[PDB]
Design a binder for this molecule. Structure first.
Ligand SMILES: C[As](C)(=O)[O-]
Ligand SMILES: C[As](C)(=O)[O-]
Ligand SMILES: C[As](C)(=O)[O-]
Ligand SMILES: C[As](C)(=O)[O-]
Ligand SMILES: [Zn+2]
Ligand SMILES: [Zn+2]
Ligand SMILES: [Zn+2]
Ligand SMILES: [Zn+2]
Lengths: 125, 125, 125, 125
């Protein structure tokens, strides 16, 4: 399994998405851990032109706080959907902006696990 | 010509971008005001796949706090660039998600002014 | 008051969208005119991460043919919707890559009219 | 090794990017094969709001021709850079719109090989 700090991200993201009204525009929450120990959250902004996924809003929120490197991140869907693997675009942005980051996804056993971003983007660009 | 609240937005966004390390990835900050009086900030996340502009990070931050309708927004560039009009993509997202919002831009005389989002997208899609 | 070539763009985009199966992923066609006289077409690719609008596929198609500067562009929707004004994102990309381009939109009387891209993005970023 | 159609795609994409002026806006070409016997090309349209990668332009070009299903795709960088693996966003769009497609990438030996899109996006969204 994952460490307690990483497990805290799941709780924080879950709390964030479940604390707001059900919406088709804001349906996913994300939480990331910075190298200094702070946690940053955010929800997605859906739009056909490429509204940011929750993870990208988190990256912007962390940057606004001069958080520096982010070490772990997770996305939680609304309506008790739980952990959601980051989409291809988010994986690319994470790899390019925080190459040392790990994302929390569900393994074959459906259990939470933190994986290096490069593993989610083999032969990545 | 701006209200007290609007001037505060400019100050908040300016302080945000000036407070972080100069970066090519995080170079613009934005601040928005919600109908309930709360202010939300954020900085952009640059990426060729369409990393969110500061305004979009602000929309997700506001949504994460269940801010509801946003009434005004502004973007401030790093290196003392001052007010920057929202780009075309942000105008579209703002129009679609917060149709009653205004954006602070510089008028033909270089003076800050709050304009209805529809005015920034004539014959908008 | 559209030129012969401008009206031809409308015909070409209309023919394109009426030549493919009705789809929720590919619902808009676009056609643009190059200064060298050639016409390029395209259809959008819908995706939440920001799949390109028909106009952007056209820009990439024109680029692949070494078209150079485009002078006019139009978007035609399926379901017999007719002319669609470019969305905010397309306006920004068009302004940044083809600043002298015009986009065909509907005037107050619902008739086709070519408008400078700068007019579609007042006080543009 | 690569099949005949796979080597042909590389040649077509390579010829495409090498046939246009060197540009920072149009720097990658892509080519895809459709199940109905056609090959579609395209070049990227760089833009901070998420201008489409060459692969997305190809998808819209194929869609405009009512191509249906794309079975293989490849991207070639300008300035003799050769094969470029699809970025994360492209992998997501490809997986969602053409789940049965294969993408040509370089293996650990620098040797080109066609791989199922799902393989490039482990535990995708
Ligand atoms: C799981 As997601 C769509 O926030 O990359
Ligand atoms: C002024 As902007 C680049 O944050 O849309
Ligand atoms: C009118 As459009 C959605 O092709 O920018
Ligand atoms: C290698 As690409 C940037 O055309 O996904
Ligand atoms: Zn994502
Ligand atoms: Zn913007
Ligand atoms: Zn558009
Ligand atoms: Zn790509």
């Amino acid at each position: 399994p994952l460490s307690q700090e990483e497990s805290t991200l799941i709780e924080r993201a879950t709390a964030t998405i479940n604390s707001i009204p059900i919406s088709e525009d804001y349906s996913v929450a994300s939480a990331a851990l910075s190298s200094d120990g702070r946690i940053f959250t955010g929800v997605n902004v859906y739009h056909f032109t490429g509204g940011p996924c929750a993870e990208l809003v988190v990256l912007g929120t962390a940057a606004a706080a001069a958080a520096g490197n982010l070490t772990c991140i997770v996305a939680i869907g609304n309506e008790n959907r739980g952990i959601l693997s980051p989409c291809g675009r988010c994986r690319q942005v994470l790899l390019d902006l925080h190459p040392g980051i790990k994302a929390i996804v569900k393994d074959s056993d459906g259990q939470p696990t933190a994986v290096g971003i490069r593993e989610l983007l083999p032969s990545g660009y």
